[PDB]
Write a protein that binds this ligand. Structure first.
Ligand SMILES: Nc1ncnc2c1ncn2[C@@H]1O[C@H](COP(=O)(O)OP(=O)(O)OP(=O)(O)O)[C@@H](O)[C@H]1O
Ligand SMILES: Nc1ncnc2c1ncn2[C@@H]1O[C@H](COP(=O)(O)OP(=O)(O)O)[C@@H](O)[C@H]1O
Ligand SMILES: [Mg+2]
Ligand SMILES: [Mg+2]
Lengths: 64, 60, 470, 485, 121
């Protein structure tokens, strides 16, 4: 009896563990994909060098 | 539910020839082993939350 | 090709700082190369100090580096040769051939750095391993595919010990082996290479069943701290890809910590207690974790550990115990008595020291021997202060036996035959247990003690006792 | 952004210093571009020091890092039972996703002075030398201190196994869920430790928080606290949970590593001043909640590894000062045969009888006496028969009383089976029996009672006490077996 | 051969006779020889001894020809014995030197040369 249980449940849990692994992976490449599209946003877009001097000069100020 | 012919052990001790004490010993321990075992091994296993699994699947 | 150029900016001992360009920084644990007239000085990324500056660890002699030489990024961790191609050849840390046999033709090149197997992959076994050494097979028997440790101060018998194991397992093993010399006498390697040819294990114009990796003490702190990985990588390959039994011999494993301990200060690490580096437990950990048996293949590991100042409380030895299944501690206090291998029977334990493993009979005999040797050592304060006569009838009878068994643990090795003059003797576990058993029952209370000193099988004891009487 | 994000200024030694995150919290988690996560322990005006949970090979310079807005948290609840999780609380056994009933912060404040009760619920370990000599109580903090390879784990391990006597029952206020915290142990060891509990059917109520040595230091730092919360769950909800920290020694080493790399002041033996605040803020979490709080309880069995009996060391002194008793173990005692080698002389318990079954207390009050006088007259045993009869009597008992405590591993005995053995020992019904047959004596004696005097055993198990009637009935049954022997 | 091993036994017996108990023939025999071997090893600085002069001395020690000589005698014995061979049995010294080993014949002559000297004086 215990063996039947363990084995079935084991087959079931496999699907979850798998499903879980897929999600994780994908959402790795997904949030990581963010990186390479934002390193493309600043390196490119010369209009993302203006939004540079911007937010940053708002540093000196506040602190003081 | 099991039937289990009741057993007084000191009598059992007193009916084994010496050249057979070995056997009798092993017979005793197996019993004890076996008993301990059933104390811990439940009649049936836990059920299986089928709804839950049904709730998290992918193959139909 | 599209390589990344760099330039050295600082040189202090075995620590080289390279200054790359923006967006061109190599991750940690990446190799580097610098062209020299003599050879190549590989470096290994360690830290990122910032400002496009990286700190590496010199894999070789740092003398001859010019402020600002251009370094070539390898683009990945140090690559070592793998496959049956490395069988029967000597290899250094960088993975270059050092036996004058030309280039090593390997189909693959796998990095020395890799993650430890997953908890899921871990496979437990209970099989026993028969070596031929009484004091071991009877007390702490080694496990097939297990991790072994040979502890012992300087000049106790750790090398001769591990050498015999090779003379009794390696030939007798239908698989492959890997020897890794870390921080040892270059001459010991030489003798080894000579014996592997003479035994037939390594054939220059034939087949071989063992690879050789050396990173001796003559090498800088960089080398001795990564040579252990270099040889591990070659073993691991036969483990997973080849999927077969493998014998890993490491000697010595203490140099792995020490070597790192030398440079840790120069890498800006606050020295931990006893001078060792803070990253002791982890480093010692990331090495032993890799050295293990998976569901893909079995790996039997024999790592000899060094004990600084005959002190077992030392972090280096202390930490290593938890990564071992079978520990064979050697005491200098045992060497001096003339009894060898100077194995400590009480302090040495094993995993297979269970009735349900070695057998019920085997356990009982082993336990009796231990209790006998203990009481003996307990009465050491009476045998010198009150003599032997003061002891009780039960005590004197035990004491005599304890002295016979003690001397009966000694065994002549074919390796140290030049030291003892007596021909090696290999005892079988099946006979070993049967021997002490007989002595524990008092069946040889007539035979003289000197008849048990340096003797193999139990039959030889009686033969010897009779040859002396003449 | 600069306020929710930051750039890696420098990385190394598993610690990278980032710039930015001007709104990040203390000890808060963070996530790097690569995927590896870390938590900032040091919050400097210019930069922020952050430890890593993974290889520092993934982290590079200038790399981007973003907040998580959450402190170290781990999922708790009864779903963990029978699983094996890491410091964070993820599955590593491969049995699927975990089903928790909520989360709890790694850092929880210990119960106040008022919400507690004097420990009074015994924790039967199934070890004769323990439950008789050093009794443990639900909510107590008993320390398992001892040199390497002495039998420290054996003590705890048997304890867990000895719980099948109540956990498979129906009553809850009687059960005891076990939470083992593997710190600094190789995977091979854990995989075996787990495999032992299964072959005994113990995983059914055990929780394994594995923190292998290869894992990053911080993991080995959070492991004990993570597991701490998990058990508190049971405590808060009005139950009983046993947690064994094996071992705190390894934890301190890990923590020392982080502290040094972060360039914090080094103290005795290279341990920062807050090292004591670490363990004190851990052990004090286990206690005995009052009736109003839920009567719940959390027992702690911390393991400390000494270096050659040196209990005077820094770490040990800290732990020993906080706990409420020690189960000192010596290798020497182990070699003689006395297994488990529990040094009665040193082993102590501040709670004592307060948490011990009266059925055993009535026969144990004297057992500490004889053994006490035995250690004093132990040198005489080495001399000739010239010893007077008075002292000789002590030797007769001690040899046998010490021989009885010897208990094989993986073989816990219930109180109903302990009392009969102690009662026959104390009175001295074994003195006539050879000191070589003491072992088989236990076997044949227990089997006897369970066939002829089963009614006596069962009355001791239920009542938990020994009435004048039983004391006489037990004595008569003993003298009868000793006679026929 | 087992000379180093023997000197180990000597220190073993030397420490055990500290008790102040009488010693039998065995423990005193080895004690007598072990005590003299330690006295034979004592050599003056700036006085290197060839191989042909070391072998003979050690020979008479490991065997037991010095046992029957007083301790304060071992001193002059060394010099006297050497002068004896360099005068009479010099042929042997020449064989040991060149050969560097001991043949069945060389042992015979060497054996007789030792006993003959013990008898002298
Ligand atoms: N009660 C016992 N009876 C018989 N053998 C025992 C007992 N307890 C421990 N052992 C033996 O102890 C060995 C392991 O001891 P144990 O694990 O208890 O020490 P430890 O505290 O874990 O030491 P370490 O810190 O090295 O893990 C095993 O080989 C086992 O044979
Ligand atoms: N089987 C043996 N019998 C006697 N002496 C031995 C034996 N094995 C080793 N030794 C002694 O130990 C010495 C070598 O020590 P070694 O193995 O290098 O120890 P360590 O590992 O501490 O360096 C040898 O010179 C020899 O005298
Ligand atoms: Mg050596
Ligand atoms: Mg342990």
């Amino acid at each position: 009896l215990h063996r039947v249980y363990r084995e079935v449940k084991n087959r079931l849990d496999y699907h979850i563990s798998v499903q879980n692994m897929m999600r994780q992976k994908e959402q790795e490449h997904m949030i990581n994909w963010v990186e390479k599209r934002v390193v493309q946003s600043i390196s490119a877009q010369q209009e993302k060098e203006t939004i540079a001097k911007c937010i940053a000069d708002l540093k000196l100020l506040s602190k003081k | 539910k099991l039937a289990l012919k009741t057993i007084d052990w000191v009598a059992f001790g007193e009916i084994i020839p010496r050249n057979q004490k070995a056997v009798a010993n092993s017979l005793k321990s197996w019993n004890e082993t076996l008993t301990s075992r059933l104390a811990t091994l439940p009649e049936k296993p836990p059920a299986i939350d089928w709804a839950y699994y049904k709730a998290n699947v992918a193959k139909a | 090709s599209t390589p990344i150029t760099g330039k050295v900016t600082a040189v202090i001992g075995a620590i080289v700082d390279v200054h790359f360009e923006q967006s061109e920084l190599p991750a940690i644990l990446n190799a580097l190369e610098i062209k020299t007239p003599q050879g190549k000085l590989v470096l290994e990324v360690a830290q990122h100090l910032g400002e496009n500056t990286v700190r590496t660890i010199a894999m070789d002699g740092t003398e001859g580096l010019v402020r600002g030489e251009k370094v070539l990024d390898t683009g990945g961790p140090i690559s070592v040769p793998v496959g049956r191609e490395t069988l029967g050849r000597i290899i250094n840390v960088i993975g270059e051939p050092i036996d004058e046999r030309g280039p090593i033709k390997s189909k693959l090149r796998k990095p020395i750095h890799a993650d430890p197997p997953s908890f899921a992959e871990q496979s437990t076994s209970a099989e026993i391993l028969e070596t031929g050494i009484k004091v071991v097979d009877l007390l702490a028997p080694y496990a097939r595919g297990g991790k072994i440790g040979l502890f012992g101060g300087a000049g106790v018998g750790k090398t001769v010990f591990i050498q015999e194991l090779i003379n009794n397992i390696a030939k007798a093993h239908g698989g492959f082996s890997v020897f890794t010399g870390v921080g040892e006498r270059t001459r010991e390697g030489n003798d080894l290479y000579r014996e592997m040819k003479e035994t037939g294990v390594i054939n220059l114009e034939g087949e071989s069943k063992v690879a050789l990796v050396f990173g001796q003490m003559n090498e800088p702190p960089g080398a001795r701290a990564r040579v252990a990985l270099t040889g591990l990588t070659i073993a691991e390959y036969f483990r997973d890809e080849e999927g077969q039994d493998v014998l890993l011999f490491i000697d010595n494993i203490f140099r792995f910590t020490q070597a790192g301990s030398e440079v840790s200060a120069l890498l800006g690490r606050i020295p931990s207690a006893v001078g060792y580096q803070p990253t002791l437990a982890t480093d010692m950990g990331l090495l032993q974790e890799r050295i293990t048996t998976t569901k893909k293949g079995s790996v039997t590991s024999v790592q000899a550990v060094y004990v600084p100042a005959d002190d077992l409380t030392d972090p280096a030895p202390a930490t290593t115990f938890a990564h071992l299944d079978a520990t064979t501690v050697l005491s200098r206090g045992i060497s001096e008595l003339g009894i060898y291998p100077a194995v400590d029977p009480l302090d040495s334990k094993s995993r297979l020291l269970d009735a349900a493993v070695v057998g019920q009979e085997h356990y009982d005999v082993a336990s009796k021997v231990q209790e006998t040797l203990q009481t003996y050592k307990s009465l050491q304060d009476i045998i010198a202060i009150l003599g032997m006569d003061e002891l009780s009838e039960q005590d004197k009878l035990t004491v005599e036996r304890a002295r016979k068994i003690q001397r009966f643990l000694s065994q002549p090795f074919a390796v140290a035959e030049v030291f003892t003059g007596i021909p090696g003797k290999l005892v079988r576990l099946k006979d070993t247990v049967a021997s002490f058993k007989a002595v524990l029952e008092g069946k040889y209370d007539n035979i003289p003690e000197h008849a048990f000193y340096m003797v193999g099988g139990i039959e030889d004891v009686v033969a010897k006792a009779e040859k002396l009487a003449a | 952004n600069l306020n929710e994000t930051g750039r890696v200024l420098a990385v190394g030694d598993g610690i990278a210093r980032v710039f930015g995150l001007n709104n990040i919290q203390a000890e808060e988690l963070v996530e790097f571009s690569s995927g590896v996560k870390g938590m900032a322990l040091n919050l400097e005006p210019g930069q922020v020091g952050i430890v890593l949970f993974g290889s520092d090979r993934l982290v590079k310079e200038g790399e981007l890092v973003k907040r998580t807005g959450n402190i170290v948290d781990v999922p708790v609840g009864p779903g963990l039972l029978g699983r094996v999780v890491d410091a964070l609380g993820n599955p590593i056994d491969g049995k699927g996703p975990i089903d928790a009933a909520g989360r709890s912060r790694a850092q929880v404040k210990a119960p106040g002075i008022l919400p507690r009760r004097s420990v009074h619920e015994p924790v039967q370990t199934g070890l004769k030398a323990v439950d008789a000599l050093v009794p443990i109580g639900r909510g107590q903090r008993e320390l398992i201190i001892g040199d390497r390879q002495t039998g420290k784990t054996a003590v705890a391990l048997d304890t867990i196994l000895n719980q099948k006597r109540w956990n498979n029952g129906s009553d809850e206020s009687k059960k005891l869920y076990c939470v083992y915290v593997a710190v600094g142990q190789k995977r091979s060891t854990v995989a075996q430790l787990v495999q032992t509990l299964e072959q005994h059917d113990a995983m059914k109520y055990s929780i394994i928080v594995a923190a292998t040595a290869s894992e990053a230091a911080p993991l080995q730092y959070l492991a004990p606290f993570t597991a701490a919360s998990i058990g508190e769950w049971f405590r808060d909800n009005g139950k009983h949970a046993l947690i064994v920290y094996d071992d705190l020694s390894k934890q301190a080493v890990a923590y020392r590593q982080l502290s040094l790399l972060l360039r914090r002041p080094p103290g005795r033996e290279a341990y920062p001043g807050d090292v004591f605040y670490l363990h004190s803020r851990l052990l004090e979490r286990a206690a005995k909640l009052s009736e109003k709080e839920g009567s719940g309880s959390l027992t702690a069995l911390p393991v400390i590894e000494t270096q050659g009996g040196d209990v005077s060391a820094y770490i040990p002194t800290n732990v020993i000062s906080i706990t409420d008793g020690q189960i000192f173990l010596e290798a020497e005692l182990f070699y003689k045969g006395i297994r488990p080698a529990i040094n009665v002389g040193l082993s102590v318990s501040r709670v004592g009888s307060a948490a011990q079954v009266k059925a055993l207390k009535q026969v144990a009050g004297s057992l500490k006496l004889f053994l006490a006088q035995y250690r004093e007259v132990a040198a005489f045993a080495q001399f000739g028969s010239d010893l007077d009869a008075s002292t000789k009597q002590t030797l007769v008992r001690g040899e046998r009383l010490t021989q009885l405590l010897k208990q094989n591993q993986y073989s816990p005995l219930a109180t109903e089976e302990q009392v009969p053995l102690i009662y026959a020992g104390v009175n001295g019904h074994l003195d006539g029996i050879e000191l070589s047959r003491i072992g088989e004596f236990e076997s044949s004696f227990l089997s006897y009672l369970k066939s002829n005097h089963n009614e006596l055993l069962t009355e001791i198990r239920e009542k938990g006490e020994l009435s004048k009637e039983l004391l006489a009935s037990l004595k008569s049954a003993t003298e009868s077996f000793v006679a026929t022997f």
